[PDB]
């Protein structure tokens, strides 16, 4: 329980884009209250081999950060859409059609004109004006927030205890939220 704990699995909130709070993986537990030492020892080696994978998965995939579940992810640490620039082939020459029309020709329908060899091409930035920060998506909640294997739980001075497992806890208030 302290040596081989149950991992705290994180609850996502798709609206705020943050983790709600982590509770232990109670719903994937395996029942060896009817097993003996030939099989309790084999299941406890699977509880511990899983916890080695989750520490290995967090060392590969989770972003190194001080506060677990921060409230505003920076724009450099959030996956952002960076598309290719949009290449716009402009259909009509503007000042070559105000000279045909002033000369008396009625243009209708629609190089693309037979009376103009000129062709304008415009290249526009597709991405946003400012990079987005504040909340991670679903796919970055999968990469980060690997379930926390919390060895020897709640034994270190308080304040070092993980309060960001709790779904009521504001980090910048250091208090649990209420109904008002």
């Amino acid at each position: 329980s302290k040596e081989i704990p149950t991992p705290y699995m994180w609850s996502y909130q798709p609206q705020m884009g943050l983790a709600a709070g982590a509770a232990q993986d109670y719903s994937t537990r395996i029942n060896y209250m009817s097993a003996g030492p030939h099989m309790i020892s084999r299941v406890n080696g699977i509880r511990a081999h899983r916890n080695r994978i989750l520490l290995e998965q967090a060392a590969i995939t989770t972003t190194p950060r001080n506060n677990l579940n921060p409230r505003s992810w920076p724009a450099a640490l959030v996956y952002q859409e960076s598309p290719a620039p949009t290449t716009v082939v402009l259909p009509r020459d503007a000042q070559a059609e105000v000279q045909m029309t002033n000369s008396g020709a009625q243009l209708a329908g629609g190089g693309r004109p037979s009376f103009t060899p000129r062709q304008a091409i415009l290249t526009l930035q597709t991405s946003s004006s400012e990079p987005r920060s504040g909340g991670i998506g679903t796919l970055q909640f999968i990469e980060e927030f690997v379930p926390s294997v919390y060895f020897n739980p709640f034994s270190g001075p308080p304040g070092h205890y993980p309060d960001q497992f709790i779904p009521n806890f504001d980090a910048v208030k250091d208090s649990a939220d209420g109904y008002d």
């Binding site: 609850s11 909130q13 609206q15 705020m16 709600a20 709070g21 779904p167 009521n168 806890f169 504001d170 939220d177 209420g178 109904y179 008002d180």
Partner: protein, 50 residues
Amino acid sequence: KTAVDSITQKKFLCDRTLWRIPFSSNFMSMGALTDLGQNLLYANSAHALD
């Protein structure tokens, strides 16, 4: 000078409108997304309402 003994009936009429009760911590409109809609009690958990 021959007035009768009377009692006062007070009431109001408020047509065309909705009795709004905002879900804000001070009942004020400080934004469309109120401070109790961003409250981590009401954001990270499911609560009954009666």
